[PDB]
Amino acid sequence: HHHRKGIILAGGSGTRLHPATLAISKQLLPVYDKPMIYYPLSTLMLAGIREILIISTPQDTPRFQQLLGDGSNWGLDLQYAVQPSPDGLAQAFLIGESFIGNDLSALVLGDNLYYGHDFHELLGSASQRQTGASVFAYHVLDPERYGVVEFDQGGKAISLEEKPLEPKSNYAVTGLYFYDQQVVDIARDLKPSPRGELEITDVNRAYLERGQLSVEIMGRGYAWLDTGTHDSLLEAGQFIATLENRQGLKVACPEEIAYRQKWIDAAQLEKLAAPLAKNGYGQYLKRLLTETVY
Amino acid sequence: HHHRKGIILAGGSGTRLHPATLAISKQLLPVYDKPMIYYPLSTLMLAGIREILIISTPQDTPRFQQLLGDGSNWGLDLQYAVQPSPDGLAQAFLIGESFIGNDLSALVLGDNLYYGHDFHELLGSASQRQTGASVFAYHVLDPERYGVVEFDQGGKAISLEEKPLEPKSNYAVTGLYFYDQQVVDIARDLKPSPRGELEITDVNRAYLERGQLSVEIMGRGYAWLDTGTHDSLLEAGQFIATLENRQGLKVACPEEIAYRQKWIDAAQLEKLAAPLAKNGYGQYLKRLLTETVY
Amino acid sequence: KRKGIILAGGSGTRLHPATLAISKQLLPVYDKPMIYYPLSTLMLAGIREILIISTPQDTPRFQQLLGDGSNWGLDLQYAVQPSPDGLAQAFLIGESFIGNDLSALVLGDNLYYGHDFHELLGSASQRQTGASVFAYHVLDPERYGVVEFDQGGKAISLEEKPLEPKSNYAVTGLYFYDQQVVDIARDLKPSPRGELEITDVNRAYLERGQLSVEIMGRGYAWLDTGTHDSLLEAGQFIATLENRQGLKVACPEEIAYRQKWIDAAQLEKLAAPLAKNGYGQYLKRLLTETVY
Amino acid sequence: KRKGIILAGGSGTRLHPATLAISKQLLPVYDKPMIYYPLSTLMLAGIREILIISTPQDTPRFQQLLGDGSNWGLDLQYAVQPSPDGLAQAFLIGESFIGNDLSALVLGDNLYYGHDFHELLGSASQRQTGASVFAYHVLDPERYGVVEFDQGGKAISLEEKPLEPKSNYAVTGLYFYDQQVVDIARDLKPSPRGELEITDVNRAYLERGQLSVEIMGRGYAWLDTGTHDSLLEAGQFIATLENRQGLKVACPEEIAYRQKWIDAAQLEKLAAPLAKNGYGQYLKRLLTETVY
Ligand SMILES: CCCCn1c(N)c(N(C)S(=O)(=O)c2ccccc2)c(=O)[nH]c1=O
Ligand SMILES: CCCCn1c(N)c(N(C)S(=O)(=O)c2ccccc2)c(=O)[nH]c1=O
Ligand SMILES: CCCCn1c(N)c(N(C)S(=O)(=O)c2ccccc2)c(=O)[nH]c1=O
Ligand SMILES: CCCCn1c(N)c(N(C)S(=O)(=O)c2ccccc2)c(=O)[nH]c1=O
Ligand SMILES: [Cl-]
Ligand SMILES: [Cl-]
Ligand SMILES: [Cl-]
Ligand SMILES: [Cl-]
């Protein structure tokens, strides 16, 4: 008788971006002024998630651990798992099964950057849906590269296709997914696609066929940035730099997000600022203590 | 017995950006794939404003007229005035006095670019306030360069200062202003500041002292882009290019905004596409006829 | 004596609406009008007498920008190209300007940068007979005049926008000609696309073994201004060089002064109007600083 | 025989958190690890025997990346610098590697580009006595070793990060030395900031009239990797060159192959693992294409 956790998939991108990524995983590469993984981590945090599993290669887990620790500095609890071989995104749920337990979950890709107004509220809406799965659809130039969602005249999602040659719309599914307690069992019964991968689109189609997939539009006023190529990586750095140098505010500073969620107080933030007091990042953390930012 | 119009200030930026701007006004320079003036024009249009006065130098008015015409192609009515000498932003209301008549108004700077989610609704809120004046405050790195707003502990605006050496906050007033029928008379009684200029901050302080200035925060999730330097111009081009190449959607395409406001129909948009059918811009206009974009 | 021509004519509707109000070559690349860059190139090549060819609409604009040239030690003239009917029209339009002198054409939207560019130009300019062009390795040779070389490195063919390019070597927008070019241009027939082709002019020199094709090495930057994306990149490229160095690329006043076409007192007068911005400050600092 | 050293040591906490997980010199600049660029520079200078010096933590990472060098016709060795105690420590750490040979140090985060760079390096490398450095005009000379010249153009002083720089000419991160440098390094005292200064090594050669200071001209790009903004720019600069040209900057496999240190069949083996991305495709295309 019986009476939301986060996952960040930051494993191998294979040899796709070699030789740039020969010495280090993509998700530890900087995007402008901070490691890439700070952005998806900050995203889960904005969604109010505090218990988070980082999935990386066996080779780079210690590097993630060194950067991020156990989370206690930022009011989180961070755990780690390895993905020996990159057998697909849906594998996150088998690797993370004991971590998830009987809870709701959120999966984010470790190389996905988001930006925009009321992003907190867009994340809240998905996080509040305690049943079913929630994903986001975003208009892209190149829907071929993604899971593509087709809508009917009423705006209802009626199909999902993984990397179709002739996409039914320009609406790609973003690398951010919210799931109720059915996801582990759905993942467990997945059979490898032709490429040997356990596909997240198959997971989302399972929910769709059950009438339990909410697809919310992430509007054109949001930036969902591309890190798939060297070119798009560079554009992602330039995009963040322009916003931060314009505003005097950072995007996805995890210390700041914890501070504003009240997961850490002013004294704790002051201590985090000390080691970096001579660079712009530590000076930014110090300015958060006295400035009112709306 | 007696029983909202837009202005775009696109006059002289002086010799500040010479020699780049020796042959042509700044507001006709491209930002990535379209003239700069398309962005503030699109902004007024998003606010639902259809009667718009463009203020330029006598030298470049014909160039604006050639680019934009009388508005009829886009469901607008565009008129023109000249600013013989750049005697300040508040001069817009004396130059535009007969154009404004007895109506409410909106002033936008011809070199200001905005971007973000629910921008339409942020513009709507200001446009709906039929009394008083409405402005926007945005957090910037360099508030010294702008009109700066100071808030009290409750978030109420309590002072405005033009280019203070020691800014009371990092909140700059953006170059977008909504005004009731009192603005022309307020402008008329302005005395030149020490620099010989008729200051918009003095106009906004007049409303503030009357308790009729609404200052809404434009959040950090919006991009209010800088075009003040060659560097910031270049960053503005890069910023737009990244969004448009990512999305397959344009920012501030005026034809598109008219189409979506129902100011022009599909047949009219088809005709606008014809002359540019061989380039990306005309091909974009054609794709708007058949695609559903949420 | 070698005369210069800059062809800054119409690029059609390809970059519209960005270029609806104004010719591309009057638009800035970072901190200065695009035409400063090819103008600076002719000046570096030692050319002082220069004809600028533009659309009828925009010739007043180039004129008010650049003047008769005298304040920079140049002698500038202007002419119009009514319609975009081929780069070779420059020699028809420019026939009486050229007269019996040597000539050099540069395209108004072409940007160059690199070490010893002066000597690369100086060598081509010194060759008093035949014609000299430059071949540059590019990713997309179909867009250009493509030069094919034999195993010995000799140029053996030229094709204008081939469907199947023979190499990745594009001819750049910089051409030096002897006294034969006008007469060769006058006998050109329009191509199938309806243009008087510069590549037909160059093939005429090639058939007589009088086309010197120099490699512009990979250490030189020949930047692309043909698309919006490429305009932007060119701006970022110049900005990175100038902000790194504290030195400008293709500042005509500097080049005049370094060629000794204007003296210290004239450079000082030029600085006066712009004194309150970076460009005039730059010009002032060139008076007292030794730059190697 | 001239030996090479690359100093790819710790840059402290200056770029943290971006460099918290990994040394800057193992981070990409556009399409390849930053250290490919100074490695490619030594190889272009003709240097095959090369010592890479890094933090104790990251030496395994440079090792697994670069191997013993044999697949690129190089002979690579590795050594650690326990603490960031000055660039001159390279010659102490590298003393037994150098032995009685000539040497050249390049900083692991310095990027160069330009025409005839090979000959600029080749000339310095050929000078068998004394030391050769390069002076480059920059906007912010206070950040560097600043060289002052007399009216005749002779170097007369060197200052490390002067408060009031004497010129705008910075010494770049590329240094060639004769057999004297180790012994000069061994006698260095720590500076006031607590470091063994490369500028004190260079001043020692200067006092004996044995410092050749060559101008690296404004036609060369010496790119800045010291700030986040400057990392980004360097990436945009390399991307613009490579996408324009269809040719890569500082591809070590290409440089080996062009120096004839590996043959056509070895380059082909190298291409195999990367065949499905741009980098391996590039290597394959170098087999059949003549590039001048
Ligand atoms: C709850 C505090 C939100 C303020 N905020 C913010 N809106 C942002 N954004 C710009 S964001 O909501 O779009 C965002 C937040 C986390 C990760 C990526 C974007 C941010 O990066 N950091 C912040 O502290
Ligand atoms: C009413 C149709 C709005 C859709 N839209 C849009 N949201 C935008 N934006 C990205 S925006 O609301 O931020 C905007 C609109 C006009 C000018 C600048 C930004 C746009 O540029 N063009 C559009 O057609
Ligand atoms: C005779 C003056 C040469 C120095 N020089 C120079 N080399 C350059 N170059 C960087 S350049 O030779 O590559 C060049 C010159 C004119 C136009 C484009 C590039 C320059 O822009 N301005 C200069 O004064
Ligand atoms: C002997 C091979 C020289 C051709 N070359 C070259 N010039 C360059 N350059 C662009 S470079 O000389 O300026 C250079 C070379 C190594 C590292 C940095 C720049 C190159 O990157 N790769 C090459 O194969
Ligand atoms: Cl939106
Ligand atoms: Cl916001
Ligand atoms: Cl070269
Ligand atoms: Cl040079």
| Ligand (nearest to CA of A117) | 6
Distance CA D259, CA D272 (A): 21
The structure was resolved to a resolution in Å of: 2.2
Distance CA B158, CA D269 (A): 71
Q: Is D182 exposed, middle or buried (0-12, 13-18, 19+ CB in 10 A)?
A: middle
Query: CB-based contacts of B28: which residues, under 8 Å, 6+ apart?
Result: B35, B36, B37, B60, B63, B64, B67, C21, C22
What single letter denotes the amino acid at residue C272? A
Q: Would strands A105-109 and A213-217 be described as parallel, antiparallel, or unpaired?
A: unpaired
Distance CA C2, CA B252 (A): 48
Distance CA D18, CA D27 (A): 10
Residues C14/C106, Cβ–Cβ less than 8 Å: no
Written as six digits, the tokens of C10 are: 């119409």
Buried b (16+ CB within 10 A) or exposed e, D89-128: bbbebbeebbeeebbbbbbbbbbbbbbbbeebbeebbeee
End-to-end CA distance of chain D: 28
CB-closest option in C115, C240, C292 to D114: C115
Query: CB-based contacts of B99: which residues, under 8 Å, 6+ apart?
Result: B5, B7, B53, B79, B81
Domain of residue B239: give its range: 4-294
SS3 A27: helix
- Using the Cβ of D274 and the Cβ atoms of chain A, whether some distance falls under 8 Å is answered with yes
Distance CA D116, CA D113 (A): 9
Distance CA C170, CA A121 (A): 53
Distance CA C281, CA C276 (A): 7
What single letter denotes the amino acid at residue A240? I
CB-closest option in B117, B223, B248 to A139: B248
- Using the Cβ of D224 and the Cβ atoms of chain C, whether some distance falls under 8 Å is answered with yes
Report DSSP letters for C76-142, one per residue: EEEEE-SS---TTHHHHHTHHHHTTSEEEEEETT-EEE-TTHHHHHHHHHH--SSEEEEEEE-S-GG
| Nearest one of C99, C108, C97 to C62, comparing CA atoms | C108
Instruction: Mark yes or no for CB contact A118/B117 under 8 Å.
Output: yes
Distance of CA D150 to the CA centre of its chain: 28
Residues A136/A43, Cβ–Cβ less than 8 Å: no
Could you identify the residue written with the tokens 């195993």? C151
Domain count, chain A: 1
DSSP C276: T
**Residue B181's CB: how many other CB atoms inside 10 A?**
14
Say how many CB pairs under 8 Å bridge B and C.
101
Written as six digits, the tokens of B21 are: 């701007």
Residues D34/D108, Cβ–Cβ less than 8 Å: yes
Q: Is D49 exposed, middle or buried (0-12, 13-18, 19+ CB in 10 A)?
A: middle
Instruction: Mark yes or no for CB contact C114/D117 under 8 Å.
Output: no
Distance CA A148, CA A223 (A): 18
Written as six digits, the tokens of C17 are: 């609406």
Positive or negative, the Cα torsion across C9, C14, C19, C21? positive
DSSP C169: E
Regarding the beta carbon of B114 and ligand 2, being less than 6 Å apart is answered yes
| Nearest one of C159, C158, C170, C176 to C220, comparing CA atoms | C170
Instruction: Mark yes or no for CB contact B15/C231 under 8 Å.
Output: no
What single letter denotes the amino acid at residue B12? G
Distance CA D154, CA B116 (A): 57
Could you identify the residue written with the tokens 């010592």? D51
Instruction: Mark yes or no for CB contact C15/B279 under 8 Å.
Output: yes
Residues of B in contact with C19 (CB under 8 A): 30
Written as six digits, the tokens of D167 are: 């010129």
Residue D231: HSE in the Cβ half-sphere, 13 Å Cα cutoff:
27
Cα–Cα distances (Å) from B223 to B14, B227, C223, in that order, read: 26, 12, 30
Distance CA D81, CA D90 (A): 8
How many residues are recorded in chain B?
294
Q: Would strands C32-33 and C28-29 be described as parallel, antiparallel, or unpaired?
A: antiparallel
Distance CA B204, CA A115 (A): 31
End-to-end CA distance of chain A: 48
Distance CA C167, CA C147 (A): 7
Chain D residue closest to C152 (CA)?
D290
| Nearest one of C22, C20, C50 to C36, comparing CA atoms | C50
**Residue A277's CB: how many other CB atoms inside 10 A?**
12
R_g over Cα of chain C: 19
Please list the residues that pair with D4 across neighbouring strands: D50, D104
B256: CATH? 3.90.550.10
Chain A residue closest to B284 (CA)?
A141
Which 3-state string (H, E, C) describes chain B? CCCCEEEEECCCCCCCCCCCCCCCCHHHCEECCEECCHHHHHHHHHCCCCEEEEEECCCCHHHHHHHHCCCHHHCCEEEEEECCCCCCHHHHHHHCHHHHCCCCEEEEECCCEEECCCHHHHHHHHHHCCCCEEEEEEECCCHHHCEEEEECCCCCEEEEEECCCCCCCCEEEEEEEEECCCHHHHHHCCCCCCCCCCCHHHHHHHHHHCCCEEEEECCCCCEEECCCCHHHHHHHHHHHHHHHHHHCCCCCCHHHHHHHHCCCCHHHHHHHHHHHCCCHHHHHHHHCCCCCCC
Cα–Cα distances (Å) from C68 to C62, C73, C78, D12, D36, in that order, read: 10, 10, 9, 56, 50
Q: For chain B, which chains pass the contact test of at least 3 CB pairs under 8 Å?
A: A, C
Q: Is C83 exposed, middle or buried (0-12, 13-18, 19+ CB in 10 A)?
A: exposed
Residues of A in contact with D229 (CB under 8 A): 241, 245
Kindly give the number of the ligand 2 atom that is closest to the alpha carbon of B250.
21
**Residue C143's CB: how many other CB atoms inside 10 A?**
13
Written as six digits, the tokens of C113 are: 């940068």
Query: CB-based contacts of D209: which residues, under 8 Å, 6+ apart?
Result: none
CB-closest option in C136, C219, C236 to D114: C219
| Nearest one of D46, D23, D44, D19 to D35, comparing CA atoms | D23
Regarding the beta carbon of D249 and ligand 4, being less than 6 Å apart is answered yes
Could you identify the residue written with the tokens 């809406």? A125
Distance CA A244, CA A250 (A): 5
Cα–Cα distances (Å) from D137 to B32, B93, C36, C111, in that order, read: 31, 49, 22, 22
The residues placing their C-beta within 5 Å of ligand 8, an ion, are C 115; D 217-219
Instruction: Mark yes or no for CB contact B15/C229 under 8 Å.
Output: no
Distance of CA B155 to the CA centre of its chain: 26
Largest CA distance in chain A: 57
Regarding the beta carbon of D284 and ligand 4, being less than 6 Å apart is answered no
Written as six digits, the tokens of D10 are: 């710790």
Distance of CA B222 to the CA centre of its chain: 15
Written as six digits, the tokens of B1 are: 């017995």
Please list the residues that pair with D244 across neighbouring strands: none
Rounded to 5°, the CA angle B44-B207-B225 comes to 40
Ligand 5 mean position, distance from CA C256 (Å): 52
Structure solved using which method?
Answer: X-ray
Q: Would strands C131-137 and C211-215 be described as parallel, antiparallel, or unpaired?
A: parallel
What single letter denotes the amino acid at residue D136? Y
Could you identify the residue written with the tokens 């912010």? D140
Please list the residues that pair with B267 across neighbouring strands: none
Distance CA B285, CA B278 (A): 12
Distance CA D236, CA D234 (A): 5
Q: Is the peptide bond before A19 cis (omega within 30 degrees of 0)?
A: yes
Instruction: Mark yes or no for CB contact A64/D21 under 8 Å.
Output: yes
| Nearest one of C165, C112, C107, C170 to C138, comparing CA atoms | C170
Which 3-state string (H, E, C) describes chain D? CEEEEEEECCCCCCCCCCCCCCCHHHCEECCEECCHHHHHHHHHCCCCEEEEEECCCCHHHHHHHHCCCHHHCCEEEEEECCCCCCCCHHHHHCHHHHCCCEEEEEECCCEEECCCHHHHHHHHHHCCCCEEEEEEECCCHHHCEEEEECCCCCEEEEEECCCCCCCCEEECCEEEECCCHHHHHHCCCCCCCCCCCHHHHHHHHHHCCCEEEEECCCCCEEECCCCHHHHHHHHHHHHHHHHHHCCCCCCHHHHHHHHCCCCHHHHHHHHHHHCCCHHHHHHHHHHHCCCC
Please list the residues that pair with D105 across neighbouring strands: D5, D175
Residues B66/B57, Cβ–Cβ less than 8 Å: no
Please list the residues that pair with D33 across neighbouring strands: D28
Distance CA D175, CA D41 (A): 12
Regarding the beta carbon of D222 and ligand 4, being less than 6 Å apart is answered no
Report DSSP letters for A29-79, one per residue: SEETTEETTHHHHHHHHHTT--EEEEEE-TTTHHHHHHHHTTSGGGT-EEE
